[PDB]
Design a protein around this motif. Structure first.
Motif, PDB file in Angstrom:
ATOM      1  N   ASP A  79      55.028  95.519  36.856  1.00 32.65           N
ATOM      2  CA  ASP A  79      53.593  95.615  36.991  1.00 32.65           C
ATOM      3  C   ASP A  79      53.210  96.233  38.354  1.00 32.65           C
ATOM      4  OD1 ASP A  79      53.037  94.639  34.395  1.00 32.65           O
ATOM      5  OD2 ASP A  79      52.772  92.607  35.113  1.00 32.65           O
ATOM      6  N   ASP A  83      50.609  99.197  38.769  1.00 33.89           N
ATOM      7  CA  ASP A  83      49.352  98.906  39.424  1.00 33.89           C
ATOM      8  C   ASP A  83      49.220  99.651  40.758  1.00 33.89           C
ATOM      9  OD1 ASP A  83      48.668  97.221  37.251  1.00 33.89           O
ATOM     10  OD2 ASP A  83      49.309  95.426  38.324  1.00 33.89           O
ATOM     11  N   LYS A  87      46.176 102.501  41.630  1.00 34.27           N
ATOM     12  CA  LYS A  87      45.283 102.382  42.776  1.00 34.27           C
ATOM     13  C   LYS A  87      45.350 103.622  43.717  1.00 34.27           C
ATOM     14  CE  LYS A  87      45.404  97.432  42.488  1.00 34.27           C
ATOM     15  NZ  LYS A  87      46.420  97.317  41.438  1.00 34.27           N
ATOM     16  N   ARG A 103      52.850 101.855  31.051  1.00 34.91           N
ATOM     17  CA  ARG A 103      52.311 100.555  30.723  1.00 34.91           C
ATOM     18  C   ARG A 103      52.218 100.358  29.198  1.00 34.91           C
ATOM     19  NH1 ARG A 103      46.218 100.263  31.810  1.00 34.91           N
ATOM     20  NH2 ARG A 103      46.407 101.373  29.855  1.00 34.91           N
TER      21      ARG A 103
END
Length: 121
Positions: A79, A83, A87, A103
């Motif tokens: 993750d 993630d 960002k 994902r």
């Protein structure tokens, strides 16, 4: 003790299963966007943005040291890869888009892994 050995066999077998999971997830990244750490030579400000960098090579080092105690810890690192990218990079980039696809495709693999980990104990 015999218990410590039994425990160690379980961890070895989890490591075996997580190695196969890691291979299946990394196949969903054929561009190799997530294969290695973001270079701090080439992105010198990176740690100002991303506090816990992650990548597949870093996960593999941890895996081979049997450093994942359970599937949750492994998923945490996967993750992070996704993630962190979503960002740092904008929506309209090949990097963001690669993370979305990883994902989505990884979900399937991780769903069955969880069933296998619970099933085999």
């Amino acid at each position: 003790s015999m218990e410590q050995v039994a425990m160690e066999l379980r961890l070895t077998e989890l490591t075996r299963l997580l190695r196969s999971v890691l291979d299946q997830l990394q196949d969903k990244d054929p561009a190799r966007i997530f294969a290695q750490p973001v270079s701090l030579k080439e992105v010198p400000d990176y740690l100002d943005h991303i506090k816990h960098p992650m990548d597949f090579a870093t996960m593999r080092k941890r895996l081979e040291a049997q450093g994942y105690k359970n599937l949750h810890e492994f998923e945490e690192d996967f993750d992070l890869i996704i993630d962190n990218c979503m960002k740092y990079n904008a929506r309209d980039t090949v990097f963001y888009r690669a993370a979305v696809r990883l994902r989505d495709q990884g979900g399937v693999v991780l769903r069955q892994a969880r069933r296998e980990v619970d099933s085999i104990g």
